Each structure stands twice: as structure tokens, then as C-alpha cells.
């Protein structure tokens, strides 16, 4: 939107807003990240600590499929249960939820659970998640 651009307001002011004393020449600091270790050093070591150097061991031909483990906390599980199959339940009967049917692999354990038993059925689980589920009375089934 040209009509808002602030250069149109700097019309008639000789310098176009870049100074008389120090002007606006082409590239007074180099093209881009230049001088990372020389004069932009203060910048790179103040605002980007850790830029320069090699850390960690290479992994030839990484496929992001082999690193794929979508998680769900325990706190989300009861949303997965429709109300009518929450009501079809009692003190001893609990809904069986297969998270892989929702797209999650691991079931982490952040958050509260109600007293209601729940039988989660996942491909992986953590310590705390099972501890919370057992403490809620529900159980665990491992599948794949």
C-alpha cells in the first residue's frame, strides 16, 4: 500500500530519512552475515549465542519418519470419549480408548485425571502416565 508508506511523508526532506552526516550507501556492513567473527562479533555473541561451531554427531540420510512419535498427555484422554459412552459406564466399567485411532503414539502424563476409570491402549507410555492411570483405577493395554 503505497499511500501509507512513510517515504511519501519524507518527500521534500533532502535526506529521505537516512541522515546527512552518515549517508545511506550500498552495503557498509558487508552482504549479509558477513564479519560474524570480526565486527558483527558483538551481535552474534550477544543475540545468537552458539552460532559458530560443530556440536553433535552426524546422521547420514535422516528420515523424519523414523523419529516420529506424536504424544498425548493423560489430561486429553477423556475428550476422546463421547458423552454417551462416558455414560455407558459405572464404578467398575471403564471406556477403552485406542489412541492410535486418534493418531498418537506415546501417552505422556501431564495434568489431572478424574476418579473415573479409563482403559487407555497405546503404543508407548511413560512412568508418570501409568502411575496416574492406575491411581485413577484404570489400566493399560500395550498394542502396535
Amino acid at each position: 500500500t503505497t499511500r501509507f508508506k512513510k517515504n511519501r511523508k519524507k518527500r521534500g526532506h533532502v535526506s529521505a530519512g537516512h541522515g546527512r552526516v552518515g549517508k545511506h550507501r550500498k552495503h557498509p556492513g558487508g552482504r549479509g552475515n558477513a564479519g560474524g567473527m570480526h565486527h558483527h562479533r558483538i551481535l552474534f555473541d550477544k543475540y545468537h549465542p552458539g552460532y559458530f561451531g560443530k556440536v553433535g554427531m552426524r546422521y547420514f540420510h535422516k528420515l523424519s519418519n523414523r523419529f516420529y512419535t506424536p504424544t498425548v498427555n493423560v489430561e486429553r484422554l477423556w475428550s476422546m470419549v463421547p458423552s454417551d459412552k462416558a455414560a455407558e459406564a459405572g464404578g467398575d466399567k471403564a471406556p477403552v480408548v485406542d489412541v492410535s485411532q486418534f493418531g498418537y503414539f506415546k501417552v505422556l502424563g501431564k495434568g489431572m485425571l478424574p476418579e473415573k476409570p479409563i482403559v487407555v491402549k497405546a503404543k508407548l507410555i511413560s512412568k508418570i502416565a501409568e502411575k496416574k492411570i492406575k491411581a485413577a483405577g484404570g489400566a493399560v493395554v500395550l498394542v502396535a
Partner: protein, 205 residues
């Protein structure tokens, strides 16, 4: 560079203005493809517009192993066990894929089921007018055939979300599933040393 920003990474040092690809012919692409589809349909009247049939297969790759999708062709084993010869399946609109391998009865029977359903709802005109040979279909059957459009067999991509309610048995509660999960990680880590220790028992003992 200057004030705190993400470090620049523009790949704009070659002669990119010689290779900018603008898409202003996109609507015309759509219209051209549509005319192409319409005239293909008119030429292949009354064959189904979706083309030949395809298998339910699983995707590869842990990320997608649980999602079924369409394949390229039924293996020779399905085409043989369905009563649909190798050379003739492309003739009656069934793809054939000589390269696939079947490793599971579940996949093989699922693809047989697709073949059987297709052969139930397939109608084939005679090569000539009055000469109805084997594999053809009756005149009164042929007179009511239209050009079926879209996906006349949809493949459900993943198994339906059912969340039923069952008993929480104590033999289920007692199961320590995290400990289970760690124990076979131990089994995998130690499979080297365990079999080394074992093999030396034969060598020396």
C-alpha cells in the same frame, strides 16, 4: 546484519529472476484438465471414469503404516485366486502389478474381496453383436449400464474410531506395562552380549 533478528538465510544469490515460476495459467490448467477428462470419458463411454480398479494396501514407513491407501495393481496371486487371468485383468479394467509381494493372509483376502465384489458388479459387452460368449452379460443387463463416475469403490483410510466400555479386570490392573516396555528395550540392547556369552558356551563348554 543488525538488531536481534533470526539470522538471514535467503537463497537469492543466483539468477533467480530467470527462473521465477508464476502460476497465472493455473485456472487455464484446471479448465484444460477438465476438458481432457470430459473427452476421455466420452471416448471410454461406458467404462467407469475412475479407470481400472486398485488394491487396498498399507502405506510404508512407521509414520503411515496404519493408513490404508490405493495401490497400483493386484498381485498375480490375487488375480489367480480370484479367477481373473493375468493377461485379461487389464482387459476388463483390473490393474495388474507383477512387482508386489503379499506377505499376509489379511491383505490377500482383502484384495480378493475387492476382486470378487468387482466381478460381481462388472458387466461386459460382447465382442460382436449376437455372439455372447463366456464372460459376457445378458442383453437386458447391458441395456441398463451407465458410466459410473467418481470413486465407485472408496477405500477407508484407517480403521474407525470405536471407544467401547469393558471391565477393568485385576489381571489387567496388575500388569506393569511401563516395566514391560523397558524390559524388551533391555532385551534389544543385550541381544549382542547374551548371544556372545551363549555361543562361547558351545565353543568351550
Amino acid at each position: 546484519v543488525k538488531h536481534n533478528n533470526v539470522i538471514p538465510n535467503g537463497h537469492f544469490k543466483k539468477h533467480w529472476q530467470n527462473y521465477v515460476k508464476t502460476w497465472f495459467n493455473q485456472p487455464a490448467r484446471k479448465q484444460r484438465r477438465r476438458i481432457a477428462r470430459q473427452k476421455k470419458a466420452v471416448k471410454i463411454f461406458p467404462r467407469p471414469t475412475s479407470g481400472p480398479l486398485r488394491p487396498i494396501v498399507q502405506c510404508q514407513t512407521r509414520k503411515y503404516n496404519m493408513k490404508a491407501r490405493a495401490g497400483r495393481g493386484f498381485t498375480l496371486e490375487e488375480l489367480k485366486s480370484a479367477g481373473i487371468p493375468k493377461k485379461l485383468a487389464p482387459t476388463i479394467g483390473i490393474s495388474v502389478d507383477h512387482r508386489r509381494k503379499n506377505r499376509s493372509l489379511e491383505g490377500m483376502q482383502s484384495n480378493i474381496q475387492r476382486l470378487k465384489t468387482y466381478k460381481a458388479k462388472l458387466v461386459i459387452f460382447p465382442r460382436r453383436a449376437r455372439k455372447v460368449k463366456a464372460g459376457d452379460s445378458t442383453p437386458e443387463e447391458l441395456a441398463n449400464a451407465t458410466q459410473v463416475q467418481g470413486d465407485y469403490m472408496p477405500i477407508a483410510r484407517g480403521e474407525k474410531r470405536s471407544v467401547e466400555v469393558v471391565k477393568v479386570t485385576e489381571e489387567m490392573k496388575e500388569f506393569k506395562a511401563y516395566g514391560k516396555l523397558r524390559v524388551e528395550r533391555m532385551n534389544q540392547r543385550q541381544l549382542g552380549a547374551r548371544q556372545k556369552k551363549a555361543a562361547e558356551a558351545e565353543k568351550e563348554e
